[PDB]
Design a protein around this ligand. Structure first.
Ligand SMILES: *[C@@H]1O[C@H](CO)[C@@H](O[C@@H]2O[C@H](CO)[C@@H](O[C@@H]3O[C@H](CO[C@H]4O[C@H](CO[C@H]5O[C@H](CO)[C@@H](O)[C@H](O)[C@@H]5O)[C@@H](O)[C@H](O)[C@@H]4O)[C@@H](O)[C@H](O[C@H]4O[C@H](CO)[C@@H](O)[C@H](O)[C@@H]4O)[C@@H]3O)[C@H](O)[C@H]2NC(C)=O)[C@H](O)[C@H]1NC(C)=O
Ligand SMILES: *[C@@H]1O[C@H](CO)[C@@H](O)[C@H](O)[C@H]1NC(C)=O
Ligand SMILES: *[C@@H]1O[C@H](CO)[C@@H](O)[C@H](O)[C@H]1NC(C)=O
Ligand SMILES: *[C@@H]1O[C@H](CO)[C@@H](O)[C@H](O)[C@H]1NC(C)=O
Ligand SMILES: *[C@@H]1O[C@H](CO)[C@@H](O)[C@H](O)[C@H]1NC(C)=O
Ligand SMILES: *[C@@H]1O[C@H](CO)[C@@H](O)[C@H](O)[C@H]1NC(C)=O
Lengths: 115, 107, 269, 116, 113, 110, 115, 103, 105, 237, 113
């Protein structure tokens, strides 16, 4: 009955930082690395970022090597994707995933439109 | 490092026998994962290790593969099954790449 | 006036010096026995990161050793190869009599460099380091030891009831570790899967987990590469905790098995 | 990947003091034991100092009191403070990283030359 | 303290045939407990920092080609280049990490012929 | 009981040096005998939890006295503790001036 | 969770008294229980302790030859057999259980002994 | 043997204040000092496991400070129930107590 | 625990032919096996001691080969009297006899 | 459970611990005594070629030492100086406490080279090597020893007639041998009569004959020497 | 058998400039019991018997001026002339009295410039 709840989204013109939060419930946040996967409106989902279970190690997709920074706080069972730099092509739905190796659990997506 | 689903698109009957295959640039030792995404819906995992199924998946959603070649087989199609599928490698986890997957649709 | 346990009717009554109880009968010195019981049986953490914390280095105290006639199989035993960061000796070489602990399920062989403040390494818990029927208060280099405490027993009636028969295979696997800053709070360990592959070590990881990790690395870990020695951070990405139960606990059964896919690997750097 | 850079080399008057700095990148500086190695122009490599993870310092006889090595982990830097330098100390000083828990120097920094 | 001695001070040899550098230690660096020889080999090309070649007397570094083969036991050791190439020209060093003072042997320079 | 101590191992698997009587073969001879590793024997006392568990407690308790005794002694290697316990036992029960029907002396008529 | 003390009363100088400390909610056999004596207005001093099984009996310097302390593990009760009572012994006595630095942690309600 | 001395024999402070009580050992004890709070007329209650560790269930306001030879205990907010006297026990040898400190 | 195993549990041979009987040890015993022939209804009699040597008075026909683990007993010619049960006794530890082999015509 | 022998009325009956016989009294610890009786007394051949066969080399067994308070004069004692063909030591250096066996009529000092498979040299028959009140299971380099077995005795009732007085002059002759392939069947011994003269050994030769061999003789020379049965009687006879 | 080797065979240094003579011993001559190094330094001016400059590795003879300072521990030692006047041209020797043979190192000749 694990529920991942995305948050944030909204409409932002390019260049203003946006913070996204995926709420986590029903599982131990500490021992699961998490993923941020962005699915385009029709084009298809592209992986964005991943964080290690403890939060120490974080990898990003080549397109977003520096623009997007991911973080998690184990105490609150929440992870935060910092949308530092916004480009129009970034507009898409964003999904959090519950496991590093295999994206077993996907939260209901959050819509982010760069506009 | 590059994973491709050989059948770019597929169409079939509501009860049709259909299968999909995923093409690997390297050789993946039973580390492929199958994800099903309904339109306008969150993607959902199906097969852990390209053989082992998830708890909630319908039995018909059985696929097998090894090394470079992996396949996902649907013994009998269903109305809900008409959705896109995805396959992911696990060897090179830092640069995980998703490739466009077959869009299952009525035949 | 060390406490001398008296076994009567399969019940342990510690003896009373002053009482000189008439009941207890010591027929011969065979009945007297010294038992070395391992700390692992006492529920203490037994993984090398935590275990090293209990060990400590001090100088100005002479080492002492005792003989325990009988001992207990230990799930985890430790063999230390510590050298100072300049290559100087840290742990005294074993004396001639001292030999490795006889029966160890898992030998944790730690070879590395650490600050070595004291002449000798002592157990902060007050326990002894057991070596092949010799219980010492000091760690000796390159000899397998299991930390434990020694109990002295008066066995019952020497009727073969105790320690003569089983009222009711020795296969020892060496888990090789590498450590820096040994013997200090700032200590880091690398589990050595093979010559070219190392795994960062955390307390959570149990010996069964480490052996499974070794298999997983061998089968599909792409361990061999030209980049160099690989240090991998590993986390079992399973909801349940890894190895909470002790080796005796629940006979280690109905324990979730972490299939190779569950483990997640990233390269530290 | 692993990059060790030496700095602070120069000309020092005999009996004077010099401070050498080794920056590190591409690895976790705190975990590894760092060493300074001296190579005279005609005398080959010579080990001149060692710093442990905990800040413990080890020196050979030649620089037993003259040299003090220090590591500051936060900024990934290694410091060798040379005092009372003599003519013999002139050489190329390398900051080397021993492999985790072993004493062989896997990675060597680009050397810096100090002249007395 | 172990003092490391490399017998061939200079080893001029033509390209493509085996070149062997011999290393002698004052007392043996073979540890009884693990039966592993505590010796390493370093290659220093002109104007570069020395780079590790062979550690544990025989174990080879990841980057190093298989041409660099090291062998020996106990007191004396050797490094063998199965086929010398122009790029290999350098000064090769010994190290013994078995004792309190880390000591490097005097360098051996190989030169093409 | 041993709940003061965090966890008590229910099973005791003990390794001990072999009994003098059992061995009859020409393997007693050191030259033809088993190597150091092989001299040991095995046993399991799993059936009785109470005795072995109590035993772990007793060992945890006695370690303090053992350490103090080691500190006082100058022995590099101490192998006389059991013999000293034996002589203490005899010296205590039969030290002297033991009444034929007294608490001090174990002797009992008939 | 509860320690109960009894046996306190009026004893003339000399003589003997038995202080009974009983354990409720704890298996006293497991834990090494201790006796602490608080002289009225003069602070606390430790008088004696026993090992859990009763093998080791430990006494303070003042009462080294005067007090005999014993434990009946069967009843979860501790007995402190004060003997040859002196004038200074007219103090409340507390029984407590050992801790990490031989630290008294659970304190039973003190009983008063008067000489 | 080692002699235990609490420097403030008595001190008075209001609620909500920062107070430090210091217990000094003549010879160094390796962080083996544990603090006891004795409510007036009631059995003492353990506070600090060993120099710094805070006993489970004791309010977090109590803070244990430790060192080789000199130990201190600080009460964060001086609630009325914490106004009771305090004691310091050494565990290096003989388990002596320092003379009590009165608030 | 040393486990004697006599491989040919029942061997049938005719007169005047070579026969080999082999006794195997679970782990190596250094030439400490002994061979005893037991005529039915009579006391066993020692034939080979130390796995090679022949006890005095035994016919020379009997011979044995010794090793750490595997031992063999060779009767050069099987005259009818030498038809009986043959036992291998291991003297290295705990003196366990073998199951035994009855040679018959 | 070491057998303990009770000597009562000049007759030896091994003590039956089970029967708790009350004839024996242990008035003092002095009555307990450990006597090391030489193996040569039992009748085994004592010359170097035969004696070497008993000694064998094994590894992985720790050496053990036991003291024997009293001992017996040994007609033949052996001193070993065996080096591997390299020169690497073959026999462990003598520990500090160990000293040569006293009261040896003949010390057979064997020096030479031989394969040394084991770390230590052990007695195949199971006997002890006796060293100056210390009986050891192993051979120590350069230290005179006599093969023997230790026995534990309860002396009779403090009468002290036994082993404190004789109920009813020490000269030691050092016979010297050179050996190759020591410790294996292919071992050759040539007795060193003199610096430049050697005589090849045979099993039959006894110390007396070897001593006369020096008189008999009068680029090192090896002499084959031929002198029925010689020395069929034991040394005591 | 401790053998002393003095690193600079000759040491040409200008007047008034610090001079350092290095002294390596095969074995450590530091005595654990008293923790004081059993080494002495001798000055032999040309044509005169050697003179005892420094003993106990660092302690300076009464006659010797303050310029001569001895330092070092364990195997290797050094003698430092803070200001080298012309009258200090000589051959400087080590001595170890830690062990039996009382060897001396090969002399080091300092020459003014
Ligand atoms: C014989 O058995 C006894 C009983 O099990 C063993 O006692 C154990 O001693 C070790 C070390 O000696 C302790 O580990 C310590 O844990 C501390 C963390 O807090 C622990 O305290 C609790 C103990 O509970 C009991 O005592 C407290 C204190 O009075 C009471 O409140 C409580 O009611 C009990 O009476 C545990 O419950 C808790 O979970 C914690 O585990 C650490 O602080 C401590 O020292 C660390 O830090 C020091 C300062 O930096 C440093 O010097 C140390 O090296 C270390 O880093 C240490 O880790 C066990 O907690 C303790 N168990 C019990 C049940 O008391 C004894 O060791 C054993 N002896 C032998 C020879 O076998
Ligand atoms: C480790 O101990 C030292 C000793 O003072 C201390 O300085 C350091 O901060 C400690 N490290 C951590 C992480 O607590
Ligand atoms: C586990 O490690 C051992 C050596 O410790 C190695 O021999 C083995 O191959 C490893 N496991 C697998 C499955 O390869
Ligand atoms: C590791 O190195 C040792 C020593 O060279 C070698 O025996 C072993 O085969 C090596 N193993 C691997 C997996 O490289
Ligand atoms: C000596 O023994 C070896 C080993 O058994 C054997 O091979 C050899 O034939 C024997 N030689 C002699 C002469 O006994
Ligand atoms: C003969 O050898 C002995 C030692 O065995 C030696 O002392 C003596 O000097 C030697 N004499 C001659 C003449 O060689």
């Amino acid at each position: 009955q694990v529920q991942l709840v995305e948050s944030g989204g909204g409409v932002v013109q390019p260049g203003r930082s946006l913070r996204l939060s995926c709420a986590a419930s029903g599982f131990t946040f500490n021992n699961y690395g998490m993923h941020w996967v962005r699915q385009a409106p029709g084009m298809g989902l592209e992986w964005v970022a991943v964080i290690w279970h403890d939060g120490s190690d974080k990898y990003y997709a080549d397109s977003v090597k520096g623009r997007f920074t991911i973080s998690r706080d184990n105490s609150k069972n929440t992870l935060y994707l910092q949308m530092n730099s916004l480009r129009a092509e970034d507009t898409a739905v964003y999904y959090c995933a519950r496991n590093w190796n295999l994206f077993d659990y996907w939260g209901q997506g959050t819509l982010v439109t760069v506009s | 490092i590059q994973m491709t689903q050989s059948p770019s698109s597929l169409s079939a009957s509501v009860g049709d026998r259909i299968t999909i295959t995923c093409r690997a640039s390297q050789s993946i030792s039973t580390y492929l994962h199958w994800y099903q995404q309904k339109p306008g819906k969150a993607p959902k995992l199906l097969i852990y290790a390209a053989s082992t199924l998830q708890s909630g998946v319908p039995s018909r959603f059985s696929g097998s593969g090894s090394g470079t070649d992996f396949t996902l087989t649907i013994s009998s199609l269903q109305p809900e099954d008409f959705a896109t599928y995805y396959c992911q490698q696990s060897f090179s986890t830092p640069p995980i790449n998703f490739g466009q997957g077959t869009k299952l649709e009525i035949k | 006036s060390i406490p001398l346990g008296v076994i009567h009717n399969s019940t342990l009554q510690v003896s009373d010096v002053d009482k000189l109880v008439c009941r207890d009968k010591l027929s011969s010195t065979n009945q007297l026995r010294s038992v070395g019981l391992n700390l692992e049986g006492n529920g203490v953490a037994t993984d090398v990161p935590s275990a090293t914390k209990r060990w400590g280095f001090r100088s100005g105290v002479p080492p002492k050793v005792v003989n325990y006639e009988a001992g207990e199989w230990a799930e985890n035993c430790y063999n230390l190869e510590i050298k100072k960061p300049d290559g100087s000796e840290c742990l005294p070489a074993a004396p001639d009599g001292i030999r490795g602990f006889p029966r160890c399920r898992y030998v944790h062989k730690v070879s590395g460099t650490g600050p070595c403040a004291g002449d000798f390494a002592f157990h902060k818990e007050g326990a002894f380091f057991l070596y092949d029927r010799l219980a010492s208060t000091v760690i000796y280099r390159g000899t397998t030891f299991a930390e434990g405490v020694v109990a002295f027993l008066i066995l019952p009636q020497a009727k073969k009831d105790f320690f003569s028969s089983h009222p009711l295979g020795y296969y020892s696997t060496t888990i090789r570790y590498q450590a820096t800053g040994f013997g200090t709070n700032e200590t880091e360990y690398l589990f050595e899967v093979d010559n070219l592959t190392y795994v960062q070590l955390e307390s959570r990881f149990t010996p069964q987990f480490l052996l499974q990790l070794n298999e997983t690395i061998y089968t599909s870990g792409k361990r061999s590469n030209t980049t160099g020695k690989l240090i991998w951070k590993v986390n079992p990405e399973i909801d349940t905790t890894i190895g909470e139960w002790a080796f005796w606990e629940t006979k280690k059964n109905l324990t979730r098995k972490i299939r190779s896919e569950e483990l997640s690997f990233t390269v530290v750097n | 990947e692993v990059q060790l850079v030496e700095s602070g080399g120069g000309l020092v008057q005999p009996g004077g003091s010099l401070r050498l700095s080794c920056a590190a990148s591409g690895f976790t500086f705190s975990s590894y034991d760092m060493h300074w190695v001296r190579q005279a122009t005609g005398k080959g490599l010579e080990w001149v100092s060692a710093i442990g993870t905990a800040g413990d310092t080890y020196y050979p006889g030649s620089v037993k009191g003259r040299f003090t090595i220090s590591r500051e982990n936060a900024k990934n830097s290694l410091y060798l403070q040379m005092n009372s330098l003599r003519a013999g100390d002139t050489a190329v000083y390398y900051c080397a990283r021993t492999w985790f828990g072993e004493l062989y120097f896997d990675y060597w920094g680009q050397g810096t030359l100090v002249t007395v | 303290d172990i003092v490391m001695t490399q017998s061939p001070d200079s080893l001029a040899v033509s390209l493509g045939e085996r070149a062997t550098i011999n290393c002698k230690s004052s007392q043996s660096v073979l540890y009884s407990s693990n039966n592993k020889n505590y010796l390493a080999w370093y290659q220093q090309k002109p104007g570069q920092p020395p780079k590790l070649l062979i550690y544990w007397a025989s174990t080879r570094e990841s980057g190093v080609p298989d041409r660099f083969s090291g062998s020996g036991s106990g007191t004396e050791f050797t490094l063998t280049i199965t086929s010398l190439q122009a790029e290999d020209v350098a000064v090769y060093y010994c190290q013994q990490y078995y004792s309190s003072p880390l000591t490097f042997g005097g360098g051996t320079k190989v030169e093409i012929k | 009981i041993v709940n003061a101590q965090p966890k008590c191992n229910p099973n005791l698997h003990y390794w001990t040096t072999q009994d003098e009587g059992a061995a009859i073969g020409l393997a007693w001879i050191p030259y033809f005998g088993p190597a150091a590793e092989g001299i040991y024997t095995e046993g399991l006392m799993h059936n009785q939890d109470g005795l072995i568990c109590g035993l772990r407690q007793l060992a945890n308790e006695t370690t303090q006295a053992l350490q103090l005794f080691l500190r006082a002694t100058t022995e590099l290697r101490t192998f006389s503790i059991l013999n000293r316990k034996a002589i203490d036992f005899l010296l205590q029960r039969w030290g002297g001036t033991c009444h034929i029907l007294g608490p001090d002396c174990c002797i009992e008529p008939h | 969770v509860q320690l109960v003390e009894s046996g306190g009363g009026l004893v003339q100088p000399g003589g003997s008294l038995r202080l009974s400390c009983a354990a409720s909610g704890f298996t006293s056999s497991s834990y090494a229980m201790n006796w602490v004596r608080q002289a009225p207005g003069k602070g606390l001093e430790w008088v004696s302790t026993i090992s859990g099984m009763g093998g080791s009996t430990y006494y303070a310097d003042s009462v080294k030859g005067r007090f005999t302390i014993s434990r009946d593990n069967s009843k979860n009760t501790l007995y402190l057999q004060m003997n040859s009572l002196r004038a200074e012994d007219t103090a409340v006595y507390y029984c407590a259980k050992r801790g990490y630095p031989h630290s008294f942690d659970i304190w039973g309600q003190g009983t008063m002994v008067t000489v």
